[PDB]
Symmetry: D2
Subunit: 223 residues, 4 copies
């Protein structure tokens, strides 16, 4: 327990972005259990819908305070409050599409406020993103390590495709606390992001993420 | 033809680099058929920029390439409707920038609206430490893919400490109407800062750009 | 069936890193169904190696992954015919390695033949200066593509002085016969050096590898 | 000088692509100060090659670049001792090739020893399906890094049926003795297949290479 982060917390989100020159805005509202690593958010496309690209490319941009951290791994995100943190992200898809995102996370009362900027370029016109042939993300494990006094997270994620097969994306994120925090050693955050409900064009989406931090499953054999 | 031999330019860029928001406005003039242009840039919000201005200069003009008669001019043909472009810029130390640009035309003036975003620049790298000294001249490689025009180019910034800092550009240019598509070709560029104040709040920038095929004849 | 509870391994690697040619011979043994193995490696040509031995250790064994019954085991299913694999390793400072490996089976012994090549390592980087302190444990992501099995993983080497040195692994595993293909899954790995002489001409290394689905339950 | 107006070439390459081993021997001759050369290549083991021969042609000669007097010639200066080079070749569909080359000189003949390795080529991509129609001409960008010479270039294979297939080349050239280092410059290349037999077991190829600065004058 950190007194400023309660056992149940609310979320409010705004995203502005551009994908292949198409502008859009998304608003979100959610709530979760930060120490349980679970959360649900309801997302609504408010400008630019129906999105001409796969909703899936956005869903990982929608919450690092909701990771279940064991007591022995320092929690970069929960320690950063009340000041909060921002993050910066590159997503390199294997067919030349590239997305950047910058996010600000602040805290007021029992509510987290997320402001996201998202930009995607060079998606092929007949590729799975602009043809909306994706079917959600496989579960993944982000690798968290310190670089220049801030926290990096890297993971190769994969979208399931219509017809089978996968579509890969290299995530490189830098997380930057707005005050000094105890820094963790190298570790893993398992993630599983799921779409619980969507309308036909994904104008209205309920999504859920479960995230848990850990060291490796395998024992050390160090001599 | 709706493009005169001398045209004005108006530009607005908004963006975020390393989490820092900024706005730049620009006015310029150029000779579209000569391949040359000059533009005056003012940082109107978020100044002084905490990162090297150089990462922005190549985002500030495709109608001002000198195209020979035997290479279709994808950009000039697109008017009056215009075109937009999309770009990823991958720096060798992990900094990555994206940019999206819309080009429209009214009267004797092109209007440029640019969104620019940079992430993951190392804090002691040359961009965040402002150690850059302008771009080398370069040669963009231009080729059609899926009915639009791509341009890829190896670029390099000169460094205060010596050596170069490398950036790979991959751009997609998308005309807003059907045009005569060009074959594979090259555009030589040289972007130069003519004048800047100490903090690069005000910058006078120049570019020369010329399309061509290879300088080397074919053997048979 | 052809794969017993204990199996021997014989290995030959021929390679060039930074223009330096070398040969490594290895003999090992392990328990394929338990996901464990030990190997003794000797640099027989080109030692002492002028680069970090760590870049080699992940090149030294896919039959030794503990596979649960509900995930098809691509590697064990491929025998007696065996499989080969192809790998690119992209280091964050510009070093790139490739490797091609053939895995065959004769009696109770696996035979590994590996070609390894490393190019463009910076002369003052951690690989050429031997500043690495082993790999962090990792999780390979395995997924089918074009009828064969790919594995992707971002790995990290620990560095003298603190911090990590990242490497993007992209492997394609290709069975020499038709097998049941698995769905998307994970293989946890931990590679450890048990013993080494001063210049790493002689190394005993150990690996534990276990395949699994996600740790997290699904809510759909 | 040790480098005459006409020089012979002898070459051997050993390689593995998509798990397929091969050996190629070559002999050629050229005019180092004119920037031109011709080579006859023969697949001596592993023919017929199951992949596009085009991926090999750029691995077959930097002493044959026409250098003007005001750019130091990194390669010619290195003789009689010579140089070696290292290269990564990242194709847009995930194929990656590495190569390491040693260049020596005896009498009036250059001796080239090449290792080549290609991995992760998609089985229905243009390389494994032999759908390529040679390289577009290109401009390699030369610059000093860590006391040696780097060359980076955007290259593109023309494809049967139209379109291009891109490959990024990153090379490090390493003289075996210290030489006068050049400033940032450009080497235009045009590499062409003049003649081949049915299975590309025998190939005659030609290259023209000329070093220069930018075409465009400085305004600043
Ligand atoms: Ca790098
Ligand atoms: Ca690709």
């Amino acid at each position: 327990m950190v007194s400023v982060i309660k056992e149940e917390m609310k979320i409010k989100l705004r995203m502005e972005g551009t994908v292949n020159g198409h502008n859009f805005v998304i608003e979100g509202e959610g709530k979760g259990n930060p120490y349980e690593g679970t959360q649900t958010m309801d997302l609504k496309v408010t400008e630019g819908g129906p999105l001409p690209f796969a909703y899936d490319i956005l869903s990982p941009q929608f919450s690092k305070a909701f990771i279940k951290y064991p007591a022995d791994i320092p929690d970069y995100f929960k320690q950063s409050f009340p000041e909060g943190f921002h993050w910066e992200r590159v997503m390199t898809y294997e067919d030349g599409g590239v997305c950047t995102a910058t996010q600000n996370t602040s805290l007021r009362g029992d509510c987290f406020f997320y402001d996201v900027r998202f930009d995607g370029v060079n998606f092929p016109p007949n590729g799975p993103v602009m043809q909306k042939k994706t079917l959600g993300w496989e579960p993944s494990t982000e690798k968290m390590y310190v670089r220049d006094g801030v926290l990096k997270g890297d993971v190769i994620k994969a979208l399931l495709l219509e017809g089978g097969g996968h579509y890969r994306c290299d995530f490189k994120t830098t997380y930057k606390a707005k005050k000094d925090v105890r820094l963790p050693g190298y570790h893993f955050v398992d993630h599983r992001i799921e779409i619980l409900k969507h309308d036909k064009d994904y104008n209205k989406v309920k999504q859920y993420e479960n995230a848990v931090a850990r060291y490796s499953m395998l024992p050390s054999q160090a001599k």
